[PDB]
Amino acid sequence: ATFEIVNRCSYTVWAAASKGDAALDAGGRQLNSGESWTINVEPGTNGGKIWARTDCYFDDSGSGICKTGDCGGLLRCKRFGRPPTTLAEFSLNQYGKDYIDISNIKGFNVPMNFSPTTRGCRGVRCAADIVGQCPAKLKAPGGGCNDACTVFQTSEYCCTTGKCGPTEYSRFFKRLCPDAFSYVLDKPTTVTCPGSSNYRVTFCPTA
């Protein structure tokens, strides 16, 4: 499948694409304002994630630091990135269907639109100013808005026992962004697409 990743933000982002144990395609790339980066993702990929990193510095060998979304200091990510990270999550060719979603379960840093470029399903969007509105105890100094589980490490926030309810903190992400997961047992906002669809991930779709 083909993913076009577009940076519409006015600032530079360092996109990243990973399935947890390996990179998807090159795994990472600088995107200046307006730049598009298209990648091939192998069919059948389960649990692929795309996200943006902000305020990065890398050297010639591709080692550095990012203030949000860092993946162990590498430009080409092969593990997932450190929160806060708005997440585009996808599993492809699962019994003939594609499943996509946007997640705030690991926090928010960049607003995002996740849409198919082929026919037969809707896209999802989380474009609200969650960083501007972030509750005081969730603001990450590096920028962005942490999820409650990252901040507090309790069983209720992390849903470690498998039973948890919504929280004051999750209800905040849900009220600004209904189409995104706010906690792990949230009512699914997964969208089902025809198998082998193609997609575009757009950072800062509104402004």
Side-chain angles (χ1 to χ4, degrees), residues 35-120:
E35 296 204 315
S36 305
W37 174 41
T38 81
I39 61 171
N40 311 127
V41 164
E42 217 207 12
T45 298
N46 208 98
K49 292 188 199 307
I50 284 171
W51 71 96
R53 300 163 291 172
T54 70
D55 285 302
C56 301
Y57 304 87
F58 297 100
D59 67 18
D60 312 309
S61 52
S63 266
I65 189 67
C66 297
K67 287 207 223 141
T68 60
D70 200 56
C71 56
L74 299 174
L75 172 54
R76 291 142 221 129
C77 292
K78 101 182 85 74
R79 94 177 322 299
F80 288 132
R82 184 183 191 274
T85 55
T86 325
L87 282 184
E89 305 178 325
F90 51 89
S91 300
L92 318 169
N93 310 108
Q94 305 294 309
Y95 300 97
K97 296 302 193 74
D98 281 7
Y99 302 94
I100 68 172
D101 66 77
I102 290 202
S103 176
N104 285 325
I105 286 164
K106 293 252 178 254
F108 177 96
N109 66 334
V110 173
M112 160 190 290
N113 180 92
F114 192 5
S115 296
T117 56
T118 62
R119 328 163 94 266

Side-chain angles (χ1 to χ4, degrees), residues 108-189:
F108 177 96
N109 66 334
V110 173
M112 160 190 290
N113 180 92
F114 192 5
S115 296
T117 56
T118 62
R119 328 163 94 266
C121 50
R122 57 177 280 248
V124 278
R125 164 172 303 190
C126 176
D129 182 12
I130 279 164
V131 188
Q133 296 303 351
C134 190
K137 294 228 202 49
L138 299 175
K139 311 206 289 153
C145 190
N146 286 124
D147 67 288
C149 166
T150 285
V151 176
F152 291 111
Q153 301 285 266
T154 71
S155 325
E156 194 56 24
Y157 290 144
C158 306
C159 216
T160 59
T161 79
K163 313 192 271 172
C164 61
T167 57
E168 197 84 319
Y169 294 127
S170 84
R171 270 175 208 122
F172 159 74
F173 290 90
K174 199 59 171 184
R175 148 173 79 81
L176 303 208
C177 281
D179 285 356
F181 285 81
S182 57
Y183 73 110
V184 316
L185 283 207
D186 210 341
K187 168 167 256 174
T189 52

